[PDB]
């Protein structure tokens, strides 16, 4: 779909108003690019908090997997976006989510030295 | 043949600036890696045996973290890399790969990570990288003489300079 | 395009050993330079303005003297080289060329000669170099931290290490 | 000529006996390669004293110029072969010889840090 492509792009580029318009015209919130990335993967990794918030309240799937098996929380975890990691955990992001290589968001935070986020993810995991 | 690919990868890297936006990293990764590419780092066995593998959607993140780490330059020196032909893939196995990063002021530290780089390229799928496995044997941290000179009569700073960044 | 040529030149150099006989230098020079090639070095303007040009029959001699000089490795790092097309020749003008040599024990000194490299390649005369002009702006001498560390409490050696090789 | 090529090669590779045979069969002592190098240029640069001596006593031209304008003395000077530089000066090598770039054997010795040879060439030049 063209509409889906435009929404993926708007989310990546941080275009709050364009995301609003595309959704209003019926752009699929759960559209996928070449790499299986959803608008929420792209907004999360690029630090676009407001788009992450709108997507989650308009039905975006919080535990969507890309081709590599990564969730939006993996991506926010890897790229050091603390507010986004929190918004994802509030809306039911799975801390035990594993990529193709069996890595959790925790291990990704560990690997890229994102200390605050690794701590939040450790406390999250203990609580059922 | 696969060598010119790592030529092109090094040359594109030589265009990095702090202005290099998140889109440039995706276009760099699209130019050189397959859609299902996988990147593995194996660390030296002295501070334990550590290994991570990342999928295609975080390969941009990996390269970018080297510059976030303070590198102003990155290039890969491959020494007589062994090329091998399979049906669907070409292998490049270099047991003398040096990963070179320059850092800025004040120490202008150059870091040289020596190890074995094993790559799998997809056979005319535009010769993009399917597998990247870097196994680190040892590293060297180089100091400009001018920085040694300015602290030569300074035990405090010589203590600072005498200690490695990582190990 | 001319860039892959300096890729190939660096890669062949990465095969140098002290066993590399006088015939290997002639075959290296034949692979990369025209029969009437000319090589010019211009030095930094601090210890005077010095310039020499050598003809094709001593270009082997020039490259070889770098290794006789104690280099164990030589490569050229070209940063966004400007390529220009004329009728009979292609020009490559790189204002950020680093000539990198590693030296061996005891100091494992790395020397980095930064300057402008201007090349003229003959237009499909197998893309061999007709003109080589390296104008040196500055240089850096790098010391491994481990060598700093071993002499850190040794004023005598710190005096030795604090002085440049050339200037 | 094939014979000339074989002689150029024998001189380069230090093959004393092969040089003897080729000359005995009428190999041109003043044969030239692609680069205008004579057997004496090649023997001089490769440190082959005995071939340099035989070539000079069998009529080799001591001041032969290659394509770049270099004489055997330029080449011996550049490559640090002191005995050969002396044998060439004894057999009338021109210390004021200039390449295409107006360099003498002296300047070449200077450039490659061949100190002994640069001194001999300076003393030579003063004497007519």
Residue numbers in the entry:
A (entry chain D), D (entry chain D): 219 to 346
B (entry chain A), C (entry chain A): 30 to 196
Paper text:
Chip/LDB and SSDP both contain N-terminal dimerization domains that constitute the bulk of their structured cores. We recently discovered that Chip/LDB and SSDP form a stable complex called ChiLS (Chip/LDB-SSDP), which binds to NPFxD motifs within the nuclear Wnt signaling factor Pygopus (Pygo) and Osa/ARID1A, a chromatin-binding subunit of the BAF transcriptional coactivator complex.
This patch is highly hydrophobic (e.g., Y81, I83, and L87 engage in direct DARPin contacts), which explains why its masking by DARPins was crucial to prevent nonspecific aggregation of the DD via this patch (called “hydrophobic patch,” below). The DD adopts a cone-shaped α+β barrel-fold, composed of a long, highly curved antiparallel β-sheet (formed by β1 to 6) whose cavity is filled by 3 α-helices (α1 to α3) that run roughly parallel to the β-sheet. The whole dimer interface is extensive (burying ∼1,500 Å2), which explains why the DD dimer is highly stable in solution. However, none of the known DD folds contain an intertwined apical extension, as seen in the XLdb1 DD. We conclude that a lateral hydrophobic surface patch of the DD is crucial for its association with SSDP.
